[PDB]
Design a protein around this ligand. Structure first.
Ligand SMILES: COCC(=O)Nc1c(C)cc(C)cc1C
Ligand code: NI
Length: 341
């Protein structure tokens, strides 16, 4: 049963709905971004049209082996016609290749589906500024006022400065960064850039990053772990046992590990500033949890919605409980009434 919030009324379209088999009456499947909760179900045996960004299409072809003839990449910021309906893809400020989708229905209704996004004032000067939006399908991941986090820029500043200090003090320290999907590439790339190193990683992860068209990426990534003092490992291995084991494997080249876990939100943020963040330490291993988010804070989300002024909001995250649903609807009404509507 495909939920109603993945269906676009008045069209043959669904969004991020690949885990339900053949959806009744769906003539085109849209994919907002290459994260597994959204792509779950796609493979080389999928034979319906898939619409997506160029970067997402590269990942579909190379990582999942979807046949080229079924992949329909669209340029960003360009009016395109799909099965007789005008659509536009907009940058979602999430992970690489992530998009929001504007649909212009034949009857004059305009719908924005945000996919996963981190709202930014820069969005207020895209093609969104050019017409009224009637229905908003909203990424409500952090739709509660306790969810505050710093800007991405402040978090990268903290990580750069921490890593540069540690390695300048001890030239035999290794830096490790955790990953389990695309996104948050700036964490490991900015650290490698300040240390004059490439980022070393598995063949599989190097393959994934090569699909992204990031400029000068051959210049910052490698599969040669020996030449690199910044290593990427699976997020599962960013703990004291996993990191002790990795250090053993580096053959006496290194005597200390500084590791980063770039999680979305921690509850340090409620009582603490970014400058006040401290690691967990055991022996010669330190682990920093840094609040690098690729989803809107509560205040960022509020500003975006109050600017857009949609007639109806359909949440796409935290929809499974009555308590969550009720809480989100109360915030939406607050936001409306504060602007005088
Ligand atoms: C009825 O639900 C939708 C809604 O409340 N929308 C809305 C919000 C959230 C804020 C502003 C400033 C204006 C509008 C129209
Ligand atoms: Ni996502």
């Amino acid at each position: 049963t495909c939920p109603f919030y993945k269906k676009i009324p008045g069209t043959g379209f669904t969004v991020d709905a690949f885990q339900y088999g053949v959806v009744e009456g769906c003539t085109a499947y849209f994919l907002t971004h290459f994260h597994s909760d959204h792509y779950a179900g796609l493979s080389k045996h999928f034979t319906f049209p898939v619409y997506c960004s160029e970067i997402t299409g590269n990942l579909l072809k190379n990582k999942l082996h979807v046949q080229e003839q079924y992949i329909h990449p669209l340029p960003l910021d360009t009016e395109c016609i799909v099965n007789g309906v005008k659509v536009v893809l907009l940058d979602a400020n999430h992970c690489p290749g992530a998009v929001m989708i504007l649909f212009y229905l034949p009857n004059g209704t305009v719908i924005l589906h945000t996919g996963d996004f981190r709202a930014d004032p820069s969005m207020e000067r895209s093609l969104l500024a050019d017409q009224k939006v009637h229905m908003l399908y909203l990424d409500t991941t952090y739709c509660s006022p306790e969810y505050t986090f710093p800007s991405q820029q402040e978090v990268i500043r903290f990580a750069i400065n921490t890593a540069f200090e540690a390695v300048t003090l001890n030239p035999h320290a290794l830096v490790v960064c955790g990953t389990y999907s695309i996104g948050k590439e700036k964490v490991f790339l900015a650290i490698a850039d300040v240390l004059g190193s490439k980022v070393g990683m598995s063949q599989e992860k190097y393959k994934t990053l090569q699909c992204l068209n990031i400029p000068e990426i051959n210049s910052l990534i490698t599969t040669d772990m020996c030449s690199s003092l910044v290593h990427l490992l699976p997020m599962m291995q960013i703990n004291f046992k996993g990191l002790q084991s990795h250090l053993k494997k580096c053959g006496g080249k290194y005597n200390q590990i500084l590791a980063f876990r770039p999680t979305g939100w921690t509850h340090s943020n409620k009582f603490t500033r970014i400058a006040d963040v401290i690691p967990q330490t055991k022996g010669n291993i330190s682990i920093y949890g840094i609040p690098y988010s690729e989803h809107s804070s509560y205040l960022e989300m509020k500003r975006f919605v109050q600017w857009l002024k949609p007639q109806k909001i359909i949440p796409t995250v935290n929809v499974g409980t009555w308590k969550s649903r009720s809480t989100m609807e109360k915030y939406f009404r607050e936001w409306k009434l504060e602007a005088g509507y």
